[PDB]
Every structure is written in structure tokens, then in C-alpha cells.
Amino acid sequence: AAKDVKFGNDAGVKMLRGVNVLADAVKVTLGPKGRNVVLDKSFGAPTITKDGVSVAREIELEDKFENMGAQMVKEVASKANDAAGDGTTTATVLAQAIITEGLKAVAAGMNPMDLKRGIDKAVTVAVEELKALSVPCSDSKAIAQVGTISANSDETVGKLIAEAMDKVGKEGVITVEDGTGLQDELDVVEGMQFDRGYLSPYFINKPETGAVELESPFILLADKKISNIREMLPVLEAVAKAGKPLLIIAEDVEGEALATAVVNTIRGIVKVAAVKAPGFGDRRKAMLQDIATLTGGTVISEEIGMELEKATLEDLGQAKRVVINKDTTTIIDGVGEEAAIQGRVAQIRQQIEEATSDYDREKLQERVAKLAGGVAVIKVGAATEVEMKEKKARVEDALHATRAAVEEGVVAGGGVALIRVASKLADLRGQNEDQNVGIKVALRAMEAPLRQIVLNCGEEPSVVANTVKGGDGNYGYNAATEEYGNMIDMGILDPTKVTRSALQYAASVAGLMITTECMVTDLP
Amino acid sequence: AAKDVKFGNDAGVKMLRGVNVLADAVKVTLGPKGRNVVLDKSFGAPTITKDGVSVAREIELEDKFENMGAQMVKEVASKANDAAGDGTTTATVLAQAIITEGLKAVAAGMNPMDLKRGIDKAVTVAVEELKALSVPCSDSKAIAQVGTISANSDETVGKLIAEAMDKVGKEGVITVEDGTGLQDELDVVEGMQFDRGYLSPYFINKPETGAVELESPFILLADKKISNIREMLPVLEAVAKAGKPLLIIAEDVEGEALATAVVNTIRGIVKVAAVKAPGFGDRRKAMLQDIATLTGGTVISEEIGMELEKATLEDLGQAKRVVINKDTTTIIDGVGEEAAIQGRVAQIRQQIEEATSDYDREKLQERVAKLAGGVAVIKVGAATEVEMKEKKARVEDALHATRAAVEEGVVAGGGVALIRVASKLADLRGQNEDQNVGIKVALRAMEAPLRQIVLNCGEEPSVVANTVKGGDGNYGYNAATEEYGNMIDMGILDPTKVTRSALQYAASVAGLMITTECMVTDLP
Amino acid sequence: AAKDVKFGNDAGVKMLRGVNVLADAVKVTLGPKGRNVVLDKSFGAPTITKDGVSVAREIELEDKFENMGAQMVKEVASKANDAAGDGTTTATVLAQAIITEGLKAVAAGMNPMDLKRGIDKAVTVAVEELKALSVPCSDSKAIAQVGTISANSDETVGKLIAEAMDKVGKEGVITVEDGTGLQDELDVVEGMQFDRGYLSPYFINKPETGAVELESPFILLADKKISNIREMLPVLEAVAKAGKPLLIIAEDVEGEALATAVVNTIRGIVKVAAVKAPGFGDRRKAMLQDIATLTGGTVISEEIGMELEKATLEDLGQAKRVVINKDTTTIIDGVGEEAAIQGRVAQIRQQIEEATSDYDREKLQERVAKLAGGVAVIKVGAATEVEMKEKKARVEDALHATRAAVEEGVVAGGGVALIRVASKLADLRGQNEDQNVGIKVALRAMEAPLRQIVLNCGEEPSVVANTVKGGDGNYGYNAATEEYGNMIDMGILDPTKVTRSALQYAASVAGLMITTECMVTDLP
């Protein structure tokens, strides 16, 4: 359709306005003294929330250009939460900061490309600095401390996490489920998890968390690309007769007839979810085998002349439960044959011993790790179903926070780590002056989160920032108690991974936006 | 419907406005320091891009006249990319330049026809000059150097290209596919390629590249003109039963019932693509035979009393994969019979020996070349599916750049070749003064690309252009490092074919537009 | 009246707009290829001019704020012409340049006060550099060369100047008058000149040059402050009876009754001009004596009981002619008594010998210099009254240019001196980064005049500037011949004083304007 096109500063003011609406709405919720945000609902009474992610989700602007600015920052900042399990609001606050001052410099005549180089440099060094400031979290004592901190100081949740991680490894697969009573339960089970999410977002099940749970599903393993439902109908019918849901693990499901029907048609009659087989090339085939033996099912491969038209229920595998999300599939309890699973693990173990290269060995043992590793299932018990459900949420949150913590450590929370590394980089320079202001732009932006936090406290942000900067190490301001001190000792910290992801993604969009000369959108 | 008609300068200002919007939007992305362009999407978050071809694709204007101007330049400039595999944005920048100054002269009272003759002359001589400035790229060392340069200095990609080209000829057919693992693979296979594109653009498949891939398709060869689906339904049903896609190679498919249903109806149920048989007259029939034997299928000819109503699956040929685009069809792995294929090649080889004219011999051997030539398939391997997919793109790009390079050599990139040849033509003259300004208009326009590139660098374009022009040979400005030097040594070059196609097509529309006196369009 | 008040950037854009109208109108006339400007007149046919001072005089804007911006730059830039006899347009061009980029930086968030400090520093050093680049003009050969150059290469005018200056000193008082015939005449005459201009601009006589000529006027010396006409009427009557004009040299004339009547009433009946007595304190009295003896008149001092009520014609002095302007009064031919004048000069000469301090000696000899110096009168002869009048103008212009040249030398004209000193100051820095951009702002602005000059030539200003900067010494671009070379040898130069005044005044307003936060004006 006829388009509306904007160039330079015109497009600049437009994006800045859309970003400021998004950022200003979301940032009010930042910190222990964060304010509420009311989100209207046609469904009934408005929702009062402090979850900056929920607010962002509702932000859409009327002006096509301004809306483009907001949707850009929203997309990138969301990648932070996906990556580190948190960081979206901080990413938005930083983004707004870098974009605001970056565009000012651009409008002052500075070179966009240089400004971006400077911003990029400061971020590189700053990430190094965060890495240095990081406090590791490896021992079970640490793991529990982080866990309870994330679970709002719940010693029990920390224990659970630490116990699960100890019983399955810090990088092992751990799930959280509803308890059967008062007592918590933990049991490692034959299972597996691979980095492959649902093909269609429309597969989301009851779990509001943006996931899909399937009780006793039938796993269908086919290394073919299923684009049409025709050669799969018989299976679907049989599955339907069983009343059990279905999980389709194929090379890829094309939205021509299969994914089309599986979604558009199966909106209640059946529970079917589809995901891509892990890996590519030959490994894709091997892994499907691992999954097959694990679930006790067989893979349908055209190479062997296997026909989905003849795929009977016995070919389908099964698991106690399966949880799929944006980019992961976890097979919780494979109905596989213990000895068979052990046989494969041994078979692959042998292959590793006779490997002729590092690459082969690596991938080979990654597979045995999955099969031989198992899944640790946490069953959150409580006195009442309400408590149980609430605690379960806490466990899920703490689990993510802790995993991120074991991976890259922990750093002073409250927006102090960012303002810390920034104070160090005061002598950093670049190939030229534009690059230098670029560097300054990033450094000043690193103070935005703390200043926002102190703003919601009704305190003076430039005074607290000035004070925190003058200090050293993990010395900061505790907005909860509104007293200065050692952030780590005060138990106010964030996984270094979320602070890093937040900064990097924020700098990413800020950079793109600062080096954008033209915007194209449909006319109203 | 009632039309709106414009004449002379009125139509002139209209087209100029439509061209300036299109060119200004697209040219911001030119050069190593090219800026970003945001393209709104209703599908979700906007797309931030630097691909001038993507931007152009989105340009549609509200004013009917201005939009005509833009659509004209877009259509011709796109032919450059199709021809040389690149050149569209440069073609647009040049076009804008020639059109801007041409119309000024026209409005000054100069003769449009003369102005165009002058422009046309300058381009003829300039193309000769580019030919002279060209550095050949024939030896495998050169082929690899160009290949890696195109693959962002990836020695491996250059190797691949050179290896493939050596194993199948520099003008042989080479395809790129996904790897089966870490290692790259290369294997010549039974295949063929002819200059015939898809009948309907609506046949475009998953490949966003404006192409269509078909895995294990059934090739239908019919030298009849299929306008109605009736006499083809039985075949379609059988194909459907096989679940395999279909490729229809017929004399021509008419949009009455066949192309209508094949597109409008087959939007998911089946995968059907249609293309015209190669050549015309008797050759059309002969070639279809070649394709038939190659794919192992048989041609349905009304001459022999063949009825499509009775066309069974055994009549249909098959290939491992088929890729069709705007103006080409490539049969990657014909399931033909080795001996049969060899028999035909021999049969035609004999025919060549007993040929009674140059024309006969020529076309005869063009056919044996296709059959006896084979297709070189490159399998891009990598450590991860992401890497593999990214590298594969690089290989595809480098492959096109290199093929263009072997054909017409290579020339100083960065908009330097055009400004070079232009500095030489300073004494060129024509039949008269109007023709002379015509010549000047084109020569000055040849500086547009470099000046744009330098503009995006934040540098002074008239100073760099002045300096580059004063130099000689492949001496230019390296916008990457922002230093002058020998473009070829600095590894900054373009295939002479793209620079040529860009200039010629740009001058084409510029000429038409400059000699346009009336525009007709529907009223709003 | 109710006011309209603006602050910060709002007032910024307003002043910038008013300055751009003023500067853009005036700068079109810059250089040998300067364009014309048409200034409407109700009096008859429009005036076509290239005199940037005339254009500026006509610039008044509708918007009260924008007009304030224009009137500010006009007032300061005019001080340059007053000081060095030229420089107004250059001052305007520079001012526009410094203001344009200064305000950009301010709007970018830079500190106004710092920016101004930087600008001020660059100007200080640059003036030093100009002083160093200066070519002295002292010997009569030089004086003549500069003179003819100013007189459009007229060897005769140069001769005249050099002859006059030699016959009366380089810092002596020289006047230009109409010739009595074909031959030029030059004669030193009993006269004097002091730095005191007319009290009311409404005293301007026939000389359109903004001056007042009085033939055989009666000089009235009164050290009293004349605010009322009452005690002066008798004198005025007597003067009227003589029909001769009158020059009133008093301590000060107050606009209550005297200056009121002398102007508002004497608009044709009499020719009366008034100026303040030179110096202050006791010196004011002494000097009046010198003037008295010089003109042969007597001073009326209340101290001695002198009453203006009784001031007869014999008390009034007389001179062949008197010329008064904005800030100077020149008594051309005092009817004093040779011996009396010689007596005073001797009397003061004695006082100098018995002086007890440097200050006394200095001022004492400044007085004898005036009396004993005399005035050199140049009589411009020609073949026709038209030629005579035209040549006379040339002599007056050349005389001013040359005097400025003897005082501070001469520098490469054509906007080359400014771009020269600027290229040297590339390493200059200040107390901080804002101060640094301030410095850069000034340096870049120093290129504006040459770039404008080359712009009017239809040439590329950034190319010529780049070339001139790369050169060294007085190497520049001759816009007249449009060839590079040694500006001084090519005879293209400006008195160092005008280039200096232009830069300083330009930086003055630019600084004030850049550090202005609020503007107040009446509402429309």
C-alpha cells in the first residue's frame, strides 16, 4: 500500500517518542519501591501490576512511526529475559538512556557510525569488568543462598534447588511439578531435554507461563518433513482412540496442511504439539534414535522405507509428562526400557572411546549426558492447594535465577554493578572524539537503573549515584532499607548473566536505532 | 475508468518525486558505512535492514503519478540484480542522477531525443572503458580470491567455489545445499538447467530468495498448452497420493483453469510449480526429450496421440530436488537411467557430426552440454546448524559474485570504476550541443555511487571524488578503512558485469523517462 | 506593555532564523563574483547593489525575536567597519558560522559558558597567528602599492596617498577634497583633528558618507555644558547675520533646549553642528585652548566669569572647512595666528621638558603633535566633474585602507588568511571537551568567508578550502582569476586590522548569543 517514508531527524524524534512511552510506562515498576501500573481489560476489572514485562506487552502506539520505535526496543529487550530469565525492564531503561543521548549527539552533527562504535566499545570493556566483579556461585551453600534469595528468603526453596542440582548436576535438567501433599518430593527420572521449542505459539497449553504440558503423551518420531496431514491421519485416529495427547518430533512440520490442521483444527478435539528434531545432518538422525529408545518408540525414516501411513501406536513412544516452550522440549519420564537405554548409553560410550576427533567426541558425550543424565523432578508440597501453587511458582523462579547464577556468578544488585563498572571506565577512549562521546553516552546510561530505583524511593538519584560511584567494590545503596552498604552482604544481587544480557541487548537496539536513516510504514 | 492524464513538465515533476523517494530510501544503505532502514511489519516487530533490495520492494507511493515513476525505476533496476546478481541499488542511484539532471535540461528547453542520444553514447563508450579497465578472473587462484573476498574473506568459501567450478567448469551449473555435518561435501550429479522461470510468482516456496525448492518432485512433461485442469486431474490425484510435489513443464500453462487452480487452489494441499518448455519450434520438442530421458519420464504429445487424461505416474519423471526462479529452472538430480542419458548424449553427438550448418551444430552441442554437463552440488557443513545456515548463505552469495567475475572480469569497487571511466570520457561529443549535455549528464551521474558512499562515511563527497578522479587506474578511496589506494590491491572490487548492467539499465529507464510526454492513470 | 518571553532553545531557534536571513542576504555579495541584491525604494526604481553594508541596513524582520537576532549581529558587525574601515560582511558571515554550530552544540547539551571559552581562546591564538602572518606596510613603495590596490589598481591614487603621508606622517591627519581642475593638489594646512563625533546623527550634511562638512564655519568654544538655548541666542543671531555655519565645541550639549532647537528647529535656517570638547578633567580645558589659538577664537569659561550671553562674533574662531563624523572632528584650516600657534606649540614644548612623569610628557606631546602637525589636504583633480567625483571616492577609500595597512600590516585576502591561521590551530585545546568543541566551532567558522567566495564563483568550496589549507604561507585561491597562487604576489590582500576586527566582533556576538537564556520583547 502507499507508504509513508521518513528520513534522518524526523524519523529520529518519532522513534524517541515511541521509546519514551514504552520505557516510562515500564520503569515506574523498577525497584523495591516500584509503583503500580493499571492495565485495562475488556474481560472485566483492570489489572493492577508491577510486572514490567506485562506492562510492555500492552504497549502499542497510534502513530505508526512511534510504534515502530517501541516495538523495536520491546523485541530486543525481551531477548534478555529469554536469555537470562530476567533483564527486560533494565534493558528497556538502558535502551531509553542510550537512545536519548545518542540521538542528541547525532542531531548535534556527530557521526552515527562512530557513536555506535564508541557505545559498542564501552559495552565490551564493561562486560569484562562485570565478569571481574562477579562473585561465583558453585558450592551448595552458595546455590542455596541464591535460591532462597530468589524465593523471597525462603530457606526451603533454596534447599530444594541445591538438593536437585546436587542430585543431577548444576547443568542438569530439573523440572518443577505440583506436589501430592504437604511434603516436597524429589526424584530423578528417565528423561531428556533438547533445545527445540514449539513450532506454533498456538500450541500453548494451560500453563500461562508460555509453555505446554502434556500428561502421558504419545511421542511420534519421524525424520521426514511433515507438510500434509494425509499420511498421518491413521496415527492421529489411533492416538485419538487412546485419548492421550501427542507430541510430534519431526525434521520439520510445514504450515501447509499438517501444522495448519494440527493447530486450526485441533483446538479441542485432541492435544497435539509439534517440535523439530534436535540438531541437523547425521546427528539429527542419531539423536532421534536416543529419543526413540528413551521413550521406547521407533523413528519413521523414509530411508528405511518407513511409511507414516502405516505408523501404528506401538511405534509411538510415551512419557509421563512433556513440557515444551519457546525454545526447549523436556521429556520428563520416558517409558523406555531401562536396559535398552543403558545399552545405547554404552554403545555411544564405546563410540566416544573410538572417536577420531575432538568434535566427534564432544557431540558424542553430549548425547550420553542427555540419556545417562536423567531429569530431576521437584514436587512442591504444601498445606493448601493455594500455598502449593504459590510456592511452586517461587521454586520455578528461584530455579532459573540460580541456574543463571551457577553459570556466570552473581553481582551487586540494585543497579549498583552497572554504575560500578561504569566508574572504572572513565579513562576509556576510542579511535576519535565521536567515538569518545559514544563511550560517554554508554557510561552515563549505565547509571539509569539505579537512578530510576532511587527515584521511585522518593530520594535524590544524582546524590545516591554520586555516593555509590565514590565508593568501591560491591558498595551500594539498599533501596529496600534505604541505607548504603555492601550489596552482596546485604543479600542484594543479580546473576551476572542478566545484567550482562540487559546491557548488551540494550546497546544492540540503541545502536541500530542510532544508525537508522529511513523508516517506511503504511499510511494511516 | 475515468483517467487522469498528464503531459510534459507536469508529468516530469511527478516522476521525479516518485523516483527521489525510492532512490533516497534505498541509497542510505550504500557502502560499508551504510545506514539502517526500518520497514514496518504488521506480522510483529519492524525489520531493521541495510539490504537496499528489501527497502525498494516496500516502496509504493500514494500519488498515482509519483508511484508510476518509482515503479518504473524499480522494474528496470531489478533487472540488473537478475542479470549480474547485484547492481539494483547502484542502478537506482545512477537512475536518479541521470533523471534528475536530464529532466532539468529538458525543462530548460533541450531536445529530449537528443539528450537521450547523448546519454546513450556516453554509456556505450563507458562500457568499452570498463571492459578495458577490467582485471580478468579465470585461473583457480583468482577464482578463489574473488570467492573469499565475497565470502567476507573466508578462505574456505573461495576454495569451495574454485573446487566446484574446476570440477564442473566455470560456466557449469553449481548448487549449494545444507550439509550433513561438519565437513563440506561436493559431488557432481545428473542434472540440467534451462532459462525458464516460474509461470506465477505465487509459486514462491520457503526460499525467501524469490525461488522455489521442491524435494523429490514429479516432473510432468507435456508439449501441449494446458489451460484447463480437467484433462490433468487424474495425474494430480496420483501425485497427491504420492505426497510428492510436482513440476509441470509444458509448452505453456494458461491462467484460465489450470494456472488458476494450481495457484489459487493449491495453496497448501499440494506443492505444484509450472514452467514453460525451453526453446520454441522443433527444438522445444527435442529439448523436452532431453529433459525426459534425464528425469526418466516421458513427454505427452498430442502428435503421438498422447492423452494427459491417461498420464500415469510412471510417465512422470523425478529428481532429488528442483529449484525454479524468476527466469531459470534447475533439475538437480534426475532419476534418469545412466545408460539412457549416455545414449542420448551419444545420439545428439552423432547428429552434430552430421550437421549441415553452424546454427544446427551450435544448438545441438548446447543440448549435449546440458545433458553431459551434470550439476555440481556443494554441501555446506559446519559445527552448528546456525553456522551451517549462515555459511551456506555466504557460499551462495560468493558463488554468484564469482560467476559474474569469471564472465567479465573484475573492476575497482566502491563506485571507483564508474568515476574512473567517466574521467576519461571528458572529451566525448555528439551530433550537437543537446547531445553534448546529454553526454555530460551521464558522466556526472557516474559519480553518484561514490559520492553517496562517501556521504554515508560522514566525509566530503566532492573532495573524495575530486581526488579519486585526479588519480589514475584502479586508484580510489577505501570507504572501509577510509584511506586512498589501489582498490584492486585493497581487495575492493565488483564484477565488471554488475557495474555494466547497473549503468546500462539505469540509463535505460532514465532515457525512457526523459522521453515521456504523457502519463495516464486511473483517478483516485 | 505586556511582554512575550522566551527561554533556552526556543529563543535559540528564533535568533538563528533572524541571523540566517541577515547573513544569507548580505553574503551573496561576497567576493569578485558576488551577486547583486535588489533593495526596493518607494522613492522610485529599486536599487541594485553589491554593497553588503547597504543590504544589511535594510534588514528588519517581522517576528520580534528573529528581528532581535538580526539586529544584534548587525550592531556588532558594524563596529568592524567603523574600526578598520571594512569587515562588516565578513563579520556577519563568521558570526553566522559560529552561531550556527555553537547553538547546535548547546542544544546537544554542551555547556554554553565552556563553548564560549573555547571560541574565545581560538580567537586569541588566531589573532596572534594573523599578527605573525602579517606583511608590514611602512615604506612609501609599500604604501603606494596598497593605495593603488585599494584604488582598483590606480597608480595615481597610490601616489597621492604616499605623498600625503610622507608630507604629514603615516599617522598624520589627511583629508580629501574636490579639485579645482585637472591637476591634483596637496597642501598641508593649519589644522587639527580630535576623536569626538557629532552629538546628534541628525547633523549629517550633504556628504552621504555619514559625515558633515561646513564651509568657513564659526567655531564656538565653551567649556560649559549647554542644555538651554537662552544664553546662546545672541551668538546664534550674530552667526546668522554672517550667514556662515557654526560648530559648537562645548563640554557637552544636553538635549533639553539646546540640542533640541539646534536640531529640530535648525533644519534649514542655519547650519549648526555640535561636538564634545576633547578629553576630560583639566586636559579638556587645555585642549580647548589649543583649539582656540588654532582657530583664533576664545573659550568661554564660567571659571573666568565668561558669559555666553555676551559671546560676540570676535570670540568665535573660524576655519576654511570642518568635517565631523560618527567619532571624529577635523578642523581643516584654522584662521589662527601663525605666531600664536607657534607660541603655544613652544609653550607646551617647554612644559614637556619640565614634565615630572611619563603620563604628563605623553599627553603633552600628543597636543603639540596635533597643533604642530597640521592637516594634509588632497584636492582630487580630473577632466570632468564626474571623473573628479568618482576618483575622489576612490582616494577616500584607498586612504582608509592604507592607514589601516600602515598600522597593522597586510595579510592574504580572499578569505585565505583566516583559513590559514585556522589550519595551524588544529592542535589547540582547552580546560575541557566542551571548551574543545568550542575551539573547533571557531576554527571551522574561519573557513566560511573563503567558502562563500568560492560558492559565488560556481566552484566547489570544500575542494578549494581543502586545497588552500593543504598549502602553506600566503598560498591561496584567486577568485578573480580562479587560479591558485601566492595571494600577496597576486596583489590580493586585506589590512590585518580588518580581518582581525571582523573575527573578534563576530566572535563577540556569537559568544553573547550562545550564552543567552531568555529574550524579552513586546507582544505583537
Q: Which is nearest to C490 in space by CA: C478, C472, C473, C479? A: C478
Shortest distance between the Cα of B144 and any Cα of chain A, in A, equals 27
Q: Mutating which of B38, B42, B265 best tests the A interface, going by the most A Cβ atoms within 10 A? A: B38
How far the first Cα of chain A sits from its last, in Å, is 10
Q: Which residues pair with B137 in a beta bridge?
A: none
Q: Which three cell numbers stand for residue C387?
A: 571623473
C493-495 vs B518-522, strand pairing mode:
unpaired
What amino acid is encoded at C335 in this protein?
Answer: V
Rg (chain B; Cα; Å): 25
Q: How far apart are CA B46 and CA C144, in angstroms?
A: 73
Residues of B with CB under 8 A from a CB of A: 21, 24-25, 28, 33, 35-40, 44-46, 48, 55, 58-62, 67, 178-182, 206, 215, 240, 243, 268-269, 271, 381, 383, 385, 388, 457-458
Chain C residues lying within 8 Å of A108, measured CB to CB = 104-105, 107-108, 110
Shortest distance between the Cα of B466 and any Cα of chain C, in A, equals 8
Which residues does A199 contact at the CB level (< 8 Å), separation at least 6? A252, A253, A259, A274, A275, A276
Cβ(B494)–Cβ(B77) under 8 Å?
no
Q: Which phi and psi angles does C520 have, rounded to 5°?
A: -125, 130
Q: Got the DSSP string for B352-408? A: HHT--SHHHHHHHHHHHHHHHH-EEEEEE--SSHHHHHHHHHHHHHHHHHHHHHHHH
A105·C104 Cβ contact <8 A: no
What amino acid is encoded at A24 in this protein?
Answer: D
C-alpha to C-alpha distances, C212 to B356, C203, C269, C310, C327, nearest whole angstrom: 108, 7, 16, 28, 12
Helix axes B448-456, B461-470, angle to 10 degrees: 130
Q: How far apart are CA A275 and CA A193, in angstroms?
A: 12
CA quadruple C493, C496, C502, C508: dihedral, nearest 10 = 160
B269·A112 Cβ contact <8 A: no
Collapsing DSSP to helix, strand or coil, C274 comes out as strand
Partner residue opposite C107 with nearest CB, options A101, A108, A433 = A108
Q: How far apart are CA B306 and CA B311, in angstroms?
A: 8
B518-522 vs B3-7, strand pairing mode:
antiparallel
Cβ(A507)–Cβ(A120) under 8 Å?
yes
CA quadruple A294, A299, A303, A306: dihedral, nearest 10 = 150
Burial A428-440 (b: 16+ CB within 10 A, else e): bebeebbbbbbbb
Collapsing DSSP to helix, strand or coil, C227 comes out as coil
What's the angle, vertex CA C383, arms to CA C379 and CA C384, rounded to 5? 95
Cβ(B271)–Cβ(B246) under 8 Å?
yes
B178·A230 Cβ contact <8 A: no
Cβ(A300)–Cβ(A307) under 8 Å?
yes
Chain C residues lying within 8 Å of B460, measured CB to CB = 462, 466
Q: Which three cell numbers stand for residue C162?
A: 604616499
Q: How far apart are CA B421 and CA B418, in angstroms?
A: 5
Rg (chain A; Cα; Å): 26
Q: Got the DSSP string for C96-140? A: HHHHHHHHHHHHTT--HHHHHHHHHHHHHHHHHHHHHHPBP--SH
C-alpha to C-alpha distances, B287 to A101, B272, B280, nearest whole angstrom: 65, 22, 9
Shortest distance between the Cα of A71 and any Cα of chain B, in A, equals 5
What amino acid is encoded at C30 in this protein?
Answer: L
Q: How many residues does chain A have?
A: 524
Q: How far apart are CA B273 and CA B236, in angstroms?
A: 12
Which chains have at least 3 CB atom pairs separated by less than 8 Å from chain C?
A: A, B
Cβ(C316)–Cβ(C220) under 8 Å?
yes
A3·B58 Cβ contact <8 A: yes
Q: How far apart are CA B395 and CA B150, in angstroms?
A: 9
Which residues does B354 contact at the CB level (< 8 Å), separation at least 6? none
Which residues does B363 contact at the CB level (< 8 Å), separation at least 6? B283
Partner residue opposite B60 with nearest CB, options A3, A256, A280 = A3
Which residues does B485 contact at the CB level (< 8 Å), separation at least 6? B475, B476, B478
A105·C108 Cβ contact <8 A: yes
CA B360 distance to own-chain centroid: 29
> Among positive and negative, which fits the CA dihedral A280, A286, A289, A291?
negative
Resolution given for this structure, in angstroms: 2.8
Rg (chain C; Cα; Å): 26
A520·B33 Cβ contact <8 A: no
Which residues does A367 contact at the CB level (< 8 Å), separation at least 6? A286, A287, A290, A348
A107·C108 Cβ contact <8 A: yes
> Among positive and negative, which fits the CA dihedral A512, A516, A522, B2?
negative
Q: How far apart are CA A347 and CA C157, in angstroms?
A: 111
Residues of A with CB under 8 A from a CB of C: 101, 104-105, 107-110, 433
Widest CA span in chain C: 73
Domain annotation for chain B: domains and CATH numbers: 1-134+410-524 (1.10.560.10), 135-190+372-409 (3.30.260.10), 191-371 (3.50.7.10)
Q: How far apart are CA A483 and CA C481, in angstroms?
A: 76
Percent of chain C as helix, strand, coil, to the nearest 5: 55, 15, 30
Q: Which secondary structure element, helix H or strand E, spans residue A330, and what is its range?
A: strand A329-331
CA quadruple B422, B424, B426, B430: dihedral, nearest 10 = -90
* DSSP structural state of residue B319: B
* Nearest C-alpha in C relative to A433: C433
Using a 10 angstrom Cβ sphere, with 0-12 exposed, 13-18 middle and 19 or more buried, the burial of residue A224 is buried
Chain A residues lying within 8 Å of C105, measured CB to CB = 108
Partner residue opposite A516 with nearest CB, options B33, B48, B58 = B48
Which chains have at least 3 CB atom pairs separated by less than 8 Å from chain B?
A: A, C
Collapsing DSSP to helix, strand or coil, C415 comes out as coil
Do the annotations mark residue B432 as ligand-binding?
A: no
Q: Which is nearest to B374 in space by CA: B195, B190, B194, B193? A: B190
B67·A2 Cβ contact <8 A: yes
Chain B residues lying within 8 Å of A281, measured CB to CB = 178-181, 381, 388
What amino acid is encoded at A415 in this protein?
Answer: G
Which residues of C sit in the known binding site for ATP? 29-32, 50, 86-90, 414, 478-480, 494
Residues of C with CB under 8 A from a CB of A: 101, 104-105, 107-110, 433
Q: Got the DSSP string for B457-499? A: TTS-HHHHHHHHHHS-TTEEEETTTTEEEETTTTT-EEEHHHH
Using a 10 angstrom Cβ sphere, with 0-12 exposed, 13-18 middle and 19 or more buried, the burial of residue B485 is middle
Experimental technique: X-ray
Which residues does C423 contact at the CB level (< 8 Å), separation at least 6? C469
Sheet holding A516-522, edge to edge: A3-7, A516-522, B36-39, B47-49
Collapsing DSSP to helix, strand or coil, A90 comes out as helix
Q: How far apart are CA B205 and CA A436, in angstroms?
A: 47
Shortest distance between the Cα of A98 and any Cα of chain C, in A, equals 14
B24·A520 Cβ contact <8 A: no
Q: How far apart are CA C398 and CA C386, in angstroms?
A: 18
Shortest distance between the Cα of B162 and any Cα of chain A, in A, equals 24
Q: Which residues pair with A253 in a beta bridge?
A: A226
Q: Got the DSSP string for A16-62? A: HHHHHHHHHHHHTT-STTPPPEEE--TTSS-EEE--HHHHHHH---S
Count Cβ atoms below 10 Å from residue B71 Cβ, excluding itself: 14
Q: Which three cell numbers stand for residue B239?
A: 501425485
Shortest distance between the Cα of C105 and any Cα of chain A, in A, equals 6
Q: Which is nearest to A170 in space by CA: A190, A151, A146? A: A146
What's the angle, vertex CA B389, arms to CA B384 and CA B395, rounded to 5? 120
Chain B residues lying within 8 Å of C462, measured CB to CB = 460, 462-463
Partner residue opposite A2 with nearest CB, options B37, B40, B62 = B62
Q: Which secondary structure element, helix H or strand E, spans residue B522, and what is its range?
A: strand B518-522
C475-478 vs C483-486, strand pairing mode:
antiparallel
Count Cβ atoms below 10 Å from residue B467 Cβ, excluding itself: 16
Count Cβ atoms below 10 Å from residue A318 Cβ, excluding itself: 21
Chain C residues lying within 8 Å of A107, measured CB to CB = 104, 107-108
Q: Which is nearest to A356 in space by CA: B156, B382, B386, B183? A: B183
Q: Which phi and psi angles does A502 have, rounded to 5°?
A: -55, -50
Q: Which is nearest to B70 in space by CA: B111, B114, B24, B37? A: B24
Q: Mutating which of C429, C433, C441, C514 best tests the A interface, going by the most A Cβ atoms within 10 A? A: C433
A518·B271 Cβ contact <8 A: no
Residue reference for cell 591627519: C173
CA C143 distance to own-chain centroid: 20
Do the annotations mark residue B290 as ligand-binding?
A: no
Cβ(C186)–Cβ(C247) under 8 Å?
no
Collapsing DSSP to helix, strand or coil, B178 comes out as strand
CA quadruple C240, C241, C243, C244: dihedral, nearest 10 = -70
C-alpha to C-alpha distances, B243 to B137, C116, C241, nearest whole angstrom: 45, 78, 127
Do the annotations mark residue B521 as ligand-binding?
A: no
B35·A11 Cβ contact <8 A: no
C104·A108 Cβ contact <8 A: yes
